[PDB]
Each structure stands twice: as structure tokens, then as C-alpha cells.
Amino acid sequence: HHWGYGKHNGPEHWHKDFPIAKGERQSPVDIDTHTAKYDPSLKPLSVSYDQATSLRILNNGHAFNVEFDDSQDKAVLKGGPLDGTYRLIQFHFHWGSLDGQGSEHTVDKKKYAAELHLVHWNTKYGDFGKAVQQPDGLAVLGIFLKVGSAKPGLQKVVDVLDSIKTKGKSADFTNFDPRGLLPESLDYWTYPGSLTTPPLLECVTWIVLKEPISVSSEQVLKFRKLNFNGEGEPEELMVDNWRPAQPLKNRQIKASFK
Numbered sequence: 001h002h003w004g005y006g007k008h009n010g011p012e013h014w015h016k017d018f019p020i021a022k023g024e025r026q027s028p029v030d031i032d033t034h035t036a037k038y039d040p041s042l043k044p045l046s047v048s049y050d051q052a053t054s055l056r057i058l059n060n061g062h063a064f065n066v067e068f069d070d071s072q073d074k075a076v077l078k079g080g081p082l083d084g085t086y087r088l089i090q091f092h093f094h095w096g097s098l099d100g101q102g103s104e105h106t107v108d109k110k111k112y113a114a115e116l117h118l119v120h121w122n123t124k125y126g127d128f129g130k131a132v133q134q135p136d137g138l139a140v141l142g143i144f145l146k147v148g149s150a151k152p153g154l155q156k157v158v159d160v161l162d163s164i165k166t167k168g169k170s171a172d173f174t175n176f177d178p179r180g181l182l183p184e185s186l187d188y189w190t191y192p193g194s195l196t197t198p199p200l201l202e203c204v205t206w207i208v209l210k211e212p213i214s215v216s217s218e219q220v221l222k223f224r225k226l227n228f229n230g231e232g233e234p235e236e237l238m239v240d241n242w243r244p245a246q247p248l249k250n251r252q253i254k255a256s257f258k
């Protein structure tokens with residue numbers, strides 16, 4: 001009996017426990033590509049993932065997270081609109097019950113089948129828990145997934161899902177290279193926003209890549225076999241774990257490309 005994505009506890013209800021849900025810098029948003037402002041002052045992204053150390057994969061009851069060792073500068077994101085160095089701590093996905101929905105951000109109202117979030121925190125704040133309390137604390141790289149050809153670099157994640165089917169299950173997940181999840185181009189949009197699940201803190205610089213990656217129908221089908229529930233509880237399939245677009249309010253979306 002807490003927040004989730006059901007009819008009785010889903011995104012429309014969250015504001016009752018987390019009033020920041022109606023705040024001024026909430027995410028996700030629709031990216032209107034014609035009113036995004038090209039900003040020549042924006043730098044290319046620098047993704048340095050060569051020394052990434054993955055540790056574990058966890059079903060936390062609303063998604064599955066692949067967690068990384070963030071006790072040193074092993075996998076970091078720099079450049080773009082960021083000042084300073086952000087360390088990778090985990091990635092996860094949001095996805096739908098059908099191929100025509102699943103992403104959190106939309107592009108000219110278009111929904112993708114899923115959205116990948118690579119979550120990084122600003123090393124100047126020392127730990128992730130301190131970082132989420134700051135307006136420049138996190139940087140999340142958002143990558144859209146469309147259904148088409150399979151993504152070979154995603155298959156190791158798909159094959160382990162049977163082992164973490166229910167809430168609270170975890171499995172060792174070492175030597176996974178997140179470089180296999182990136183598109184060819186690193187062109188992006190960026191805007192200031194928030195976590196898209198409770199506690200909905202307004203601490204995120206969003207960097208959303210223009211180029212989607214393709215995954216196969218069989219790959220995304222396997223995401224839809226996970227459960228929101230714990231073992232021994234009534235089965236509820238983990239699907240549609242996305243928050244709908246929020247008002248842009250007083251914000252400008254910037255593009256790194258024209």
C-alpha cells in the first residue's frame with residue numbers, strides 16, 4: 001500500500017504523498033522539436049565508460065536496476081551542459097504493455113516502446129544521497145528504444161531477467177559493458193527537471209539523445225514478464241511503469257544540434 005503505477009496508486013495520486021509532484025521543474029516532458037533552441041555554446045558529451053564495473057541487477061518493485069561500483073571515477077559523464085564530473089551509479093528502463101507506449105519523454109508527442117535511463121551523480125556532493133538534495137546533483141542520460149532489429153549488447157540483461165522476476169530479488173551481474181547500449185550519435189536535447197518516480201526531487205539535468213536504439217520484439221517481450229509483486233504474492237505484470245508528460249512551465253529545452 002504505497003505508490004506505484006496502478007489505478008489506485010499511480011502517477012495521478014502521487015501528489016498526495018509527494019506534493020513536489022506539482023512543482024515547477026517536473027519530468028518527463030514532451031520535447032517539441034520546433035521550439036527547442038539550438039545552443040552553440042553546448043559542448044559534446046564525454047562518456048567515459050571503459051572502466052565501468054557492474055555489480056548486481058535488482059528488481060526493486062517498479063523497475064530493474066543494474067548497479068555499478070561508484071566508489072571511484074570509473075564510469076563518468078562530463079561535458080555537454082554539465083560542470084564537473086558525474087559518476088554512473090545505475091541504469092534502468094521504463095516500458096509499456098504494447099509497443100506504442102512505454103517511454104517517459106515524448107518527441108513531438110511520439111511515444112517510444114521504452115526508455116533507458118543512465119543515472120549519474122555529481123561527485124562534488126560526495127554521495128548519491130547528498131546529490132539528490134541539490135539542483136545540479138544528478139545527470140540522467142535518456143535513450144529511446146524502438147522495436148525493430150535486436151540489440152546484441154542488451155541480450156545479457158534480457159537473459160538474466162528470469163532470475164529476478166519478483167520484487168526484492170537480486171543477482172550478481174558483473175562485467176557488463178554499458179557502451180553496448182549507446183546509439184551511434186550523441187546529439188541531444190537538455191533541460192532541467194526531476195526524478196520521474198517518488199520522491200520526485202528536482203535535482204536532475206536531463207540529457208535526452210536524439211537517436212533511438214533498436215531492440216527486437218522478443219527482447220522487449222521479456223521485460224513484460226517481470227512482476228511488480230514479491231514472491232508468493234498475487235501476480236501483477238511489470239508493464240507501463242512510466243509517468244506521463246508534465247507541464248514545461250518556465251523552462252526552455254536546448255538542442256546540441258540544428
Ligand SMILES: NS(=O)(=O)c1cccs1
Pocket residue numbers: 117119140194195196197
Ligand atoms: N527515472 S529517473 O531516472 O528519473 C530516477 C528515479 C529514481 C532514481 S533515478
Ligand SMILES: [Zn+2]
Pocket residue numbers: 092093094117196
Ligand atoms: Zn527512470
